[PDB]
Design a protein around this ligand. Structure first.
Ligand SMILES: *C(=O)[C@H](CCSC)NC=O
Lengths: 123, 208, 55, 114, 118
RNA sequence: GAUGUCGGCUCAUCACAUCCUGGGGCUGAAGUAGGUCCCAAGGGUAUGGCUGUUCGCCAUUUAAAGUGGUACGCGAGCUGGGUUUAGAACGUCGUGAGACAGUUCGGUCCCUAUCUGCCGUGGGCGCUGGAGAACUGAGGGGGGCUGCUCCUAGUACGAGAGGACCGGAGUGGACGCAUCACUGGUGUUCGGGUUGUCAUGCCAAUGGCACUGCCCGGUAGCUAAAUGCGGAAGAGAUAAGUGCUGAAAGCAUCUAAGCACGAAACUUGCCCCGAGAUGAGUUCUCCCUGACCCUUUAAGGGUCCUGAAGGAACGUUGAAGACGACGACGUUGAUAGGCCGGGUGUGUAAGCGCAGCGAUGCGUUGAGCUAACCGGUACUAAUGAACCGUGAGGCUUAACCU
RNA sequence: AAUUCCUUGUCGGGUAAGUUCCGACCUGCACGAAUGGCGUAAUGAUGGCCAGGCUGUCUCCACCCGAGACUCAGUGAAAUU
RNA sequence: CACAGGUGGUCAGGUAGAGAAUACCAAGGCGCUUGAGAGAACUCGGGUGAAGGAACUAGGCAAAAUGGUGCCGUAACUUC
RNA sequence: AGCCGAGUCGGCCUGCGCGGAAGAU
């Protein structure tokens, strides 16, 4: 459950540390984003010599949340924080070369197979 | 086609081998007994009347008892009616069981909803509340404005206001039939249906 | 908010047309002492349904 | 209700081992990827149990690759293949939510050894 | 809404309710017949009858529980020495309610309540 | 001898000179994508930074972020930032008291609803002997939105670059109804930990007060963030528009006589109310089968005998409820409380024994306690009776039985 | 600028986006030297602007504990017409 | 008005506590001159809240938050 | 006029009609 003004951590090595959500894409009057959805962000903190700078505007996809995901038998999976991966504004492909932390099987689509393949564990 | 009368028992789940959990409502359907057939010559339309259940002797008035004794069936707890299509025929005294839904795939269920009593506009119509601070004065859940000035000078008919909510007839359409059990008189459908545990339900094949 | 015209005695009566009291339908008779009482209540001497309860 | 009890008891497992809050357990689950099926393992500490007949459940917490994860399992689902107890723990409470704010040495649990 | 709920509020708060019913249970055990309002009499059964059920098995633990719930050693002694043996072979229903008239000061409905072997 | 004036919030209703979706003619219309005019009002039609702002500029979305009327809609519905009292200061004008559609800081928003109107819910009488049920449908309301991906097909079109109509399948946003099986919130009526102080003679064990003293968990019920379902397809008559046959006018012409197509607008199909529809409708069952007197002689009055079918009143009460109303039950009985067995929650009671100098630990022991839940059981309370409601149901004409 | 009409002047900083804020320029409509000019540590229920923590202020409301409103018995007003 | 307002001086017990603060008690004094039921909307005074955390608003208005003693350690500027 | 046999062309004056014609309970 991610909305405007929400702050997130970064699960890749592109240089950013903390980011903020400024829009939930999709349709008119849309409220929340969950795992697998694409949002618009601005960068609030970055390390010195990375591939991105503080103040840029880009896109991102959500990979972990504190609310979790349900499964077809009623089970749940929850995490301790909120994290995302940075994408290119036009192509919508990753910017880094590595992935940190676990991810889930909701990402198993033709669009995010690079992330699935670079991840260290898929729950 | 015709339908049947039953009682709401409760809710549970069914597990499949693939690993899916289906939520289900359990409906008990005993045998429905035909009390009267209405035809075009004597009544003006084509239908049947049915009863189900049981009733105690010292609660049945003489008019009702005579009506049952004409048909030759035991007394039940109520009377209901169903319209006939072209090509359907039944006779007085006949019994209809839940095996009627053996090949049906989707049904519609009708019942009476739970009663909330006198309700406000926030709960009854989804109105928005006004501010809880910033100088509001005794107006936190109140409805607001209800009209205009000298023109038109009145309140229009059909306006949304506070009043009684619930306790009325409701229909829910196109529910999947999950199981039919004839030995224990059971029908299992997917999803929720109106009413409380122990209330009466009417089940028909889906119209769309 | 107050009236603009004075209401009439006819209106007063029409409003009060729902104010009459209802009397008790009948009383019961105890099977031993013969007293009259309100149904499901005890009598003034201390009987109920034929037995003495309060002395 | 007798009717619902009868419908429910014909779907229950009878192999479930006995475990308590504070124990360490390993759970094996089914994973489908294409036309293949395999078993994947999840191991951790038991913080909560819900005893509700066919509707029973339990909750497991672990630290994975620098991140804390929690899973809520429905006890009688055919997705779960097997449950095993690896260690027995000694606590006082029925719910162990206070472990969410502890890390490292401050999160240790004593062994029961009864 | 109050669907499926149990209990009476009586225009009080919880501490006041608890203290009042403690005192009333003591009075009923002491005298064996009292006069009060009908709703109060109907509430009093659910406080008094479980104490009589408890007093059918004599032990230090049960006496201490009764003391916790009454705070009167005379009441405890009467329970365990007299009222348990008297009701040893009865399954529930130790009290009885009889409706009487209306109170003069405020028109409240009234009732007597008593033990069934007085 | 008083009609409260800007902007915001809450809640709306109408027009069509149409912003989106629907149907068409022309094009300096190859395709994709555009320009202009005609028909069409069913549904839909952004969040933020700045400023008192309505506007406006800027950032990022959307199929689209329409234009106007309603005391520039709405203060006996809310606010009080701006304007427009009394305090004080700057610049400017005046000798001065003072002044400025110039600026700056501060500055009391009253009313218990008689009548109309609107949302809900009852009492009376009527419908022509009385009573218990099931219906028909004149009429009225609700609902009607739309994205992206895949196949057809890299086909039609095009030098290339690009790239379809028509027709099928899946998955979403916003909105509406119901429900509590699952995930969770609450749960001062259930269990436990602990600080200060007072009491039960004292130890041990317990209770009162300090926001439920402060906290940690949690049953039933209620509930959204939870999970099921919905908008249609078909039919009739048409709008702009497209046509067939065919004269007036030997040719031509969609029209004058005849015949065929055509849209989210109209009438139906889907859901709910509905015979006070005074034009008061229909079907099934049940109940009542005695004697007299008077008078102004008639839809007249009275006296004895008789009191049905059913209804109401009273009590025990409900997932029904402001009060009325509605549903279940009253010994030929499971309606409520209690009682017995389970389940659920909390988490190893008290007493006693052992180890230790002691705070504490171990055994008896997953122990004790356990609300509103499930399955059972006449222990307590639902009394015999009294009360209301009658005794075969008007006149005229027609058609069949006698 | 507590002073500037034109005016949200032009340039730099801070934000994804700043008619307010901070630093400069001088074209001062209409600053200026005891109806004082320019600075200043400490002090202020004083005016303006930005951050950390924190939250039912808000997306968007849900449940609970108390006092009224509702029903019965006793007493018993007001404005207005 | 048998009115939640105003009115100078003296006396000073116990356990915690810096204390005449605050909590619980002693001597002593009181339950405040309409009651009884029910458990709707709305208003008044309070307790708890998934995920987010000023997105509200003229303005963080109101709420939430910090809070004791002993010790370590503490910047620009300054009339020292 | 079209591919044989009686009418046909267009200006003027005048009576009644048709289009031009979009609004808010
Ligand atoms: C004009 O200045 C304004 C007119 C009011 S007329 C009701 N008054 C301001 O005080």
């Amino acid at each position: 459950m991610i909305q405007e003004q929400t702050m997130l951590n970064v699960a890749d090595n592109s240089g950013a540390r903390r980011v903020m959500c400024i829009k939930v894409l999709g349709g008119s009057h849309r409220r929340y984003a969950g795992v697998g959805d694409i949002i618009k962000i601005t960068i609030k903190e970055a390390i010195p010599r990375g591939k991105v700078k503080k103040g840029d505007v880009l896109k991102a996809v959500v990979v972990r949340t504190k609310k979790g995901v349900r499964r077809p038998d009623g089970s749940v999976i929850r995490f301790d924080g909120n994290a995302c991966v940075l994408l290119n504004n036009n192509s919508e492909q990753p910017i880094g070369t590595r992935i940190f932390g676990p991810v889930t099987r909701e990402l198993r689509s033709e669009k995010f197979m690079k992330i699935i393949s670079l991840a260290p564990e898929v729950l | 086609m015709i339908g049947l009368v039953g009682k709401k028992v409760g809710m549970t789940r069914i597990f499949t081998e693939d690993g899916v959990s289906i939520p289900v409502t359990v409906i008990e359907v005993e045998a429905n007994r035909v009390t009267q057939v209405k035809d075009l010559a004597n009544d003006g339309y084509r239908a049947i009347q049915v009863t189900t259940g049981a009733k105690k002797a010292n609660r049945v008035t003489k008019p009702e008892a005579g009506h049952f004794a004409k048909a030759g069936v035991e007394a039940g707890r109520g009377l209901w009616e169903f319209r006939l299509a072209e090509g359907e025929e039944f006779t007085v005294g006949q019994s209809i069981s839940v095996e009627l839904f053996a090949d049906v795939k989707k049904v519609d269920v009708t019942g009476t909803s739970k009663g909330k009593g006198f309700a406000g506009t926030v709960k009854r119509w989804n109105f928005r509340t006004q501010d809880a601070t910033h100088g509001n004065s005794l107006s936190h859940r109140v409805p607001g404005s209800i009209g205009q000035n000298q023109t038109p000078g009145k309140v229009f008919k059909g306006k949304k206001m506070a009043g009684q909510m619930g306790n009325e007839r409701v229909t829910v359409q196109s529910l999947d039939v999950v199981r039919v059990d004839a030995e224990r008189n059971l029908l299992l459908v997917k999803g929720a249906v109106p009413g409380a545990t122990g209330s009466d339900l009417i089940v028909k094949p889906a119209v769309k | 908010a107050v009236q603009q015209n004075k209401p009439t005695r006819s209106k007063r009566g029409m409003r009060r047309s729902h104010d009459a009291l209802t009397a008790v339908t009948s009383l019961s008779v105890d099977k031993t002492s013969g007293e009259k009482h309100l149904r499901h209540h005890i009598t003034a001497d201390g009987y109920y349904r034929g037995r003495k309860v309060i002395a | 209700s007798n009717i619902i009890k009868q419908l429910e008891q014909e779907q229950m497992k009878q192999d479930v081992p006995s475990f308590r809050p504070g124990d360490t357990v390993e759970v094996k689950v089914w994973v489908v990827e294409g036309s293949k099926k395999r078993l994947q393992a999840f191991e951790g500490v038991v913080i909560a149990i819900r005893n509700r007949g066919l509707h029973s459940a339990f909750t497991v917490r672990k630290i994975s690759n620098g991140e804390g994860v929690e899973r809520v399992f429905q006890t009688h689902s055919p997705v779960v293949d097997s449950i095993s107890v690896k260690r027995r723990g000694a606590v006082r409470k029925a719910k162990l939510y206070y472990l969410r704010e502890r890390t490292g040495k401050a999160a240790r649990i004593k062994e029961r050894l009864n | 809404m109050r669907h499926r709920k149990s209990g009476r509020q009586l225009n009080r708060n919880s501490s006041h309710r608890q203290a009042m019913f403690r005192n009333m249970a003591g009075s009923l055990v002491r005298h064996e017949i009292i006069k009060t309002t009908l709703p109060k009499a109907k509430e009093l059964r659910r406080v008094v009858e479980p104490l009589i059920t408890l007093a059918k098995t004599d032990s230090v633990a049960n006496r201490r529980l009764a003391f916790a719930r009454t705070r009167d050693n005379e009441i405890v002694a009467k329970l365990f020495n007299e009222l348990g043996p008297r009701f040893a072979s009865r399954a529930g229903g130790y009290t009885r309610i009889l409706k009487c008239g209306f109170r003069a000061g405020d028109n409240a409905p009234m009732a007597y309540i008593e033990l069934v072997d007085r």
